């Protein structure tokens, strides 16, 4: 056999894997959280985009904090042996390190811990991708001009920089998900995933600026934040 390199995750398992989309639009009145108009546009865009990448997409709408934890626990207990990867997309309100169920918050770390290298063994060594459209704070950008770590092989694709709001358009969907889907559509058969996400960064950074009757929220910008603990390059295609 000729010389072999292992710089890329193996993505030719029988299945690409699950794509779990949690789409939280309407929140319990007692929480005081507003409806997330436009998030259904995001969820439909994501479903179609990951469908064409051959993911098994499961869309879940309006989950409580208890339903989110139970879903993630159940999913992490499936046999992923024949699956190349795992993707989870979270569309909700949030703060730094937190995403909101319809009735209250969930620590991101509690969700992701179910998939740790030591706790979901059929995903050990495989890329686990968390894509998070949610606020990470209330800052606004004014613009200008054993053998492997249990935390290895995670990628957090955050819509926004730490501490900042994330922007969502009630008609077109969120800036980040719009751009992510467009760039996966155009480049998934061409670019390594970090290079795709860098094009997403540039699209959000250059093409979007907020328009508000409220001067506090008008003319603001956004930069997403790629947080990679991956150990290999990730191509959605193979052969």
């Amino acid at each position: 056999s000729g010389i072999s390199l292992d710089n890329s995750y193996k993505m030719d398992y029988p299945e690409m894997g699950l794509c779990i989309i949690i789409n939280n639009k309407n929140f319990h009145k007692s929480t005081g959280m507003t409806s997330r108009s436009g998030t259904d546009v995001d969820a439909a865009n994501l479903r179609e985009t990951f469908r064409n990448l051959k993911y098994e997409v499961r869309n879940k709408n309006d989950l409580t904090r208890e339903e989110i934890v139970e879903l993630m626990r159940d999913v992490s207990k499936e046999d992923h042996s024949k699956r190349s990867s795992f993707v989870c997309v979270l569309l909700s309100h949030g703060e730094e390190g937190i995403i909101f169920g319809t009735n209250g918050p969930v620590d991101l770390k509690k969700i992701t811990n179910f998939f740790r290298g030591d706790r979901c063994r059929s995903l050990t060594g495989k890329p686990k991708l968390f894509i998070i459209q949610a606020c990470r704070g209330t800052e606004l950008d004014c613009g200008i001009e054993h053998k492997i770590p249990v935390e290895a092989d995670f990628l957090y694709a955050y819509s926004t920089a730490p501490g900042y709001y994330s922007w969502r358009n009630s008609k077109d969907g969120s800036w980040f998900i719009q751009s992510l889907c467009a760039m996966l559509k155009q480049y998934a058969d061409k670019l390594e995933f970090m290079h795709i996400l860098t094009r997403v960064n540039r699209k959000v950074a250059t093409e979007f600026e907020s328009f508000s009757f409220d001067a506090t929220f008008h003319a603001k910008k956004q930069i997403p934040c790629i947080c990679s603990m991956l150990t290999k390059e990730l191509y959605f295609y193979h052969l």
Partner: peptide, 4 residues
Amino acid sequence: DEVD
């Protein structure tokens, strides 16, 4: 435009 709205914030999340």
